[PDB]
Design an enzyme around this catalytic site. Sequence first.
Site, PDB file in Angstrom:
ATOM      1  N   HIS A  91      -5.351  -7.559   0.672  1.00 24.39           N
ATOM      2  CA  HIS A  91      -4.440  -6.249   0.769  1.00 24.39           C
ATOM      3  C   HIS A  91      -3.479  -6.677   1.728  1.00 24.39           C
ATOM      4  CE1 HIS A  91      -3.577  -2.346  -0.354  1.00 24.39           C
ATOM      5  NE2 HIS A  91      -3.584  -2.153   0.760  1.00 24.39           N
ATOM      6  N   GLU A 117       0.469  -4.274  -3.947  1.00 24.20           N
ATOM      7  CA  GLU A 117      -1.069  -2.833  -4.115  1.00 24.20           C
ATOM      8  C   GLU A 117      -0.403  -1.905  -3.831  1.00 24.20           C
ATOM      9  OE1 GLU A 117      -3.977  -5.476  -2.309  1.00 24.20           O
ATOM     10  OE2 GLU A 117      -3.795  -7.063  -3.525  1.00 24.20           O
ATOM     11  N   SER A 121       1.322  -1.847  -0.247  1.00 24.08           N
ATOM     12  CA  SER A 121       0.059   0.249   0.090  1.00 24.08           C
ATOM     13  C   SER A 121       1.019   1.589  -0.034  1.00 24.08           C
ATOM     14  CB  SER A 121      -1.044   0.161   1.363  1.00 24.08           C
ATOM     15  OG  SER A 121      -1.781   1.398   0.783  1.00 24.08           O
TER      16      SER A 121
HETATM   17  C1  LIG Z   1      -5.858   3.866  -3.864  1.00 25.31           C
HETATM   18  C2  LIG Z   1      -5.420   2.546  -5.677  1.00 25.31           C
HETATM   19  O1  LIG Z   1      -5.339   2.614  -6.753  1.00 25.31           O
HETATM   20  C3  LIG Z   1      -6.327   0.910  -5.773  1.00 25.31           C
HETATM   21  C4  LIG Z   1      -7.525   0.865  -4.206  1.00 25.31           C
HETATM   22  C5  LIG Z   1      -8.452   0.308  -4.105  1.00 25.31           C
HETATM   23  C6  LIG Z   1      -8.416  -0.785  -2.781  1.00 25.31           C
HETATM   24  O2  LIG Z   1      -9.673  -1.829  -2.936  1.00 25.31           O
HETATM   25  C7  LIG Z   1      -9.522   0.665  -1.706  1.00 25.31           C
HETATM   26  C8  LIG Z   1      -9.330  -0.385  -0.303  1.00 25.31           C
HETATM   27  C9  LIG Z   1      -7.051   0.022   0.227  1.00 25.31           C
HETATM   28  C10 LIG Z   1      -7.163   1.454   0.193  1.00 25.31           C
HETATM   29  C11 LIG Z   1      -5.197   2.225  -0.365  1.00 25.31           C
HETATM   30  C12 LIG Z   1      -5.637   3.228  -0.380  1.00 25.31           C
HETATM   31  C13 LIG Z   1      -6.395   3.995  -0.937  1.00 25.31           C
HETATM   32  C14 LIG Z   1      -6.448   5.139  -1.596  1.00 25.31           C
HETATM   33  O3  LIG Z   1      -7.786   6.164  -2.346  1.00 25.31           O
HETATM   34  C15 LIG Z   1      -5.268   6.242  -1.314  1.00 25.31           C
HETATM   35  C16 LIG Z   1      -4.468   5.023  -0.868  1.00 25.31           C
HETATM   36  O4  LIG Z   1      -2.907   6.393  -0.568  1.00 25.31           O
HETATM   37  C17 LIG Z   1      -4.236   4.188  -1.118  1.00 25.31           C
HETATM   38  C18 LIG Z   1      -3.387   3.420   0.288  1.00 25.31           C
HETATM   39  O5  LIG Z   1      -2.648   4.153   0.650  1.00 25.31           O
HETATM   40  O6  LIG Z   1      -2.852   2.886   0.019  1.00 25.31           O
END
Ligand SMILES: C[C@H](O)CCC[C@H](O)CCC/C=C/c1cc(O)cc(O)c1C(=O)O
Lengths: 269, 268
Positions: A242, A126, A102
């Site tokens: 995740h 991810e 993340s």
């Molecule tokens: C952001 C990706 O492109 C696609 C994510 C899709 C997942 O299902 C959402 C659930 C976990 C979210 C991560 C997240 C989301 C966001 O709007 C900004 C962020 O900074 C994050 C982060 O720190 O991970």
Amino acid sequence: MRTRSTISTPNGITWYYEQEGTGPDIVLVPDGLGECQMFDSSVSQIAAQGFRVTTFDMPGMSRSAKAPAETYTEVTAQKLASYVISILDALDIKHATVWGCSSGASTVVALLLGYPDRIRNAMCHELPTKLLDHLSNTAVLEDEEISNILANVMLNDVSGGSEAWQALGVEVHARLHKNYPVWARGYPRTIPPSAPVQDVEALRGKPLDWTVGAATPTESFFDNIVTATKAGVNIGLLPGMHFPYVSHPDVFAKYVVETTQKHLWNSSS
Amino acid sequence: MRTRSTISTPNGITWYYEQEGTGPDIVLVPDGLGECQMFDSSVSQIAAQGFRVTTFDMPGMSRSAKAPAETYTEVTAQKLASYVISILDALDIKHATVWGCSSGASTVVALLLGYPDRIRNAMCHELPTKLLDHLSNTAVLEDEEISNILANVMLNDVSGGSEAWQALGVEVHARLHKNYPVWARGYPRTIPPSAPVQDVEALRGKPLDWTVGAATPTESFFDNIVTATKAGVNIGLLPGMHFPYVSHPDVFAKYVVETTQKHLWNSS
Ligand SMILES: C[C@H](O)CCC[C@H](O)CCC/C=C/c1cc(O)cc(O)c1C(=O)O
Ligand SMILES: C[C@H](O)CCC[C@H](O)CCC/C=C/c1cc(O)cc(O)c1C(=O)O
Ligand SMILES: [K+]
Ligand SMILES: [K+]
């Protein structure tokens, strides 16, 4: 046995950190929720294969909450990478393998590109590259509404394993509950645009191993698969979604050990 | 405005087919269940934009069951491509845009590579390239067991929309019931190794548009995204999972129309 302690860096952060083992350094960077107890089982399994494993709560989060506001507001990959280098300096970790999911994924790619002499190899999982308005818009709600909404999102949408997620236990969930508003107001608007993967040629030939969750819906990290493939970066799957270190700790530990071993071989070659 | 009829090809197949519209030809190849009533709503929406749309039940399946056993056993992409060219020949469709999901995806890539003069452009969705032992192993079960297992997989695991899947109706599900064992015995052991994606350089520069379902678990068609990217083929997502034409018929129809229009502009 496991060291559990605190260390302060000159940027004003008092980190909570854990360390176990002897050998080459592996560092496990948390996801945006900044909670290193999620690595507890895996730390022991990785350290037992002959590695010194370090992890920590992230600034503003959990037991690393004594930190200046700038460390948990308008957060970027490059800010987090600077903070991680500060704790590695404080712990005299000169050369490290790094993992992150993340915002931790963005952080470890920024670490590898920005501090190449410090990073043996990076594992990213991810990596967020898209703005998601429905998550960005939680920032204006009241703290308890954010915690209720995001606790439910983590369990039901992205945990990859509801029993394992709940089994983190009351102490962990009570720390996460306090972190959700900090993350919501500091991360989702500024992390995605900071993703260090816009320059595909800068990734080519780098010691990077990228994963996405096997059960994650294809749309969530489709872009990661495309980007990694364009860059010729090794891209594969871990079980779950995740939080593979929570849902599948033994598979996670084996992946970290095997990948570190692959780079130790290649480094000598 | 829908023609619903049959046509016999000299490979022994009597096909059930449907056609609607006037204009450039668009051909909708079914997934392995071989059931073209899944395209009913989309056929009208596509034809309304100035296309002649053709679809058909696949050999051995549904209303195209009058077929020799070789057409529904040990089935490969290359066998299916030969069968589709036989019906296009019989309908005097010389140039076609083609769509296919699943074994239909393998079919349309085999068509584009094997019969380039015949294929304007191909849309492939969720192309199977891996053997799955748990599906291969359904082939040795009794017919009733196979139909119960696979009906449940389609409804609960891969439909991308259980209410739309059920709304196909009693008559369609009665045909599917009979197709499940035919599919299990003839497709999963032989379709994946026949995937026409071993030669990435053969795909480069071809008029191919590839999709995966946005809600499909990443692992299912991860390899499609990697292969398309390596080949520089346009790769994207449709809503739902394995049956976008069932779950999201209007989005599906708009995709087929827009993709066809893009290649009609490029070809000129
Ligand atoms: C952001 C990706 O492109 C696609 C994510 C899709 C997942 O299902 C959402 C659930 C976990 C979210 C991560 C997240 C989301 C966001 O709007 C900004 C962020 O900074 C994050 C982060 O720190 O991970
Ligand atoms: C098979 C893929 O490689 C990867 C994931 C597939 C889906 O999630 C499973 C549900 C639908 C099955 C498709 C399928 C399976 C199989 O074992 C052989 C096949 O020939 C097919 C086919 O013709 O679709
Ligand atoms: K495990
Ligand atoms: K629709």
